[PDB]
Design a protein around this ligand. Sequence first.
Ligand SMILES: [Co+2]
Lengths: 168, 170
Amino acid sequence: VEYEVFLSFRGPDTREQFTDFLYQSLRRYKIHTFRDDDELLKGKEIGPNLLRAIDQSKIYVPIISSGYADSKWCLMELAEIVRRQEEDPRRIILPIFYMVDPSDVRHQTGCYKKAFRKHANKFDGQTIQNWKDALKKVGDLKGWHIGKNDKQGAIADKVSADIWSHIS
Amino acid sequence: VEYEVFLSFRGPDTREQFTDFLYQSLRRYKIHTFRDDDELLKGKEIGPNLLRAIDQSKIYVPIISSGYADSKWCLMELAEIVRRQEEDPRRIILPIFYMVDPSDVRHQTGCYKKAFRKHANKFDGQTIQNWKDALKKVGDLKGWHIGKNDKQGAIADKVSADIWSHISKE
Ligand SMILES: [Co+2]
């Protein structure tokens, strides 16, 4: 019933690949997991699911792909994920760097440059900054890189086992 | 006065780069840290240091560079580190992927192919395989990647802080 793990991801990048594989593995462990899909969430899920999940989950998994900063929902959620961990350092953030160099996540360079250029047309400096600070923070945490040669199912198994053993 | 952190690394690859910076940061926290350099150990240091440190340290940091598997000492030590954490999983292993794809560490491909080709001239299959299994096990753990665009002092600082939090929570 109570949520344990919170997946933050860019739908179009990973919803069918790693994110889904990780979701499946977590269920095999009966870990109650929320999928923060930036495109497919429903209106009656905001309260009963989203806020509760983000409130209850003690483990957050940002699956950060090349299109992650293109989505304002992703950035908004990462910032909130970061804030909540800072309030309650017992909470853990476990980044997955999906087919991006962690350097680009850390400095918002490469594929992320144009996202932030775009957002700066609509949002103020403090909002943009908060979003960059969250990517830097999380980009600097230990995690798993996923590259073109990885067996994503094996990584998913490693990640879910690690999560399961901690949850005890 | 026990060792707390055990650094495993390929000397010629990282001695002057990230390994030193992490050592310096750890030292700023006054964290007692052993440098398992594959070239510069002394014999009086095998007992009262190396073995003491590998025994006492509850955090192992394998800094895995492209020349890591070229060194039999590195491979041997990784296998030991991996054996010790399985024996006592309060211990943790924190891999640094220094200018290598984690993919390659995980599957011992790319730069690591020829290394294992060469060791197979002198060691039997069981021995080679135990070494491959160590790299795979460690390559599959959460850790930090370092690339050419990274500011390694920044990363050293973040690893130090993480290590420090963990030591303190105990
Ligand atoms: Co001390």
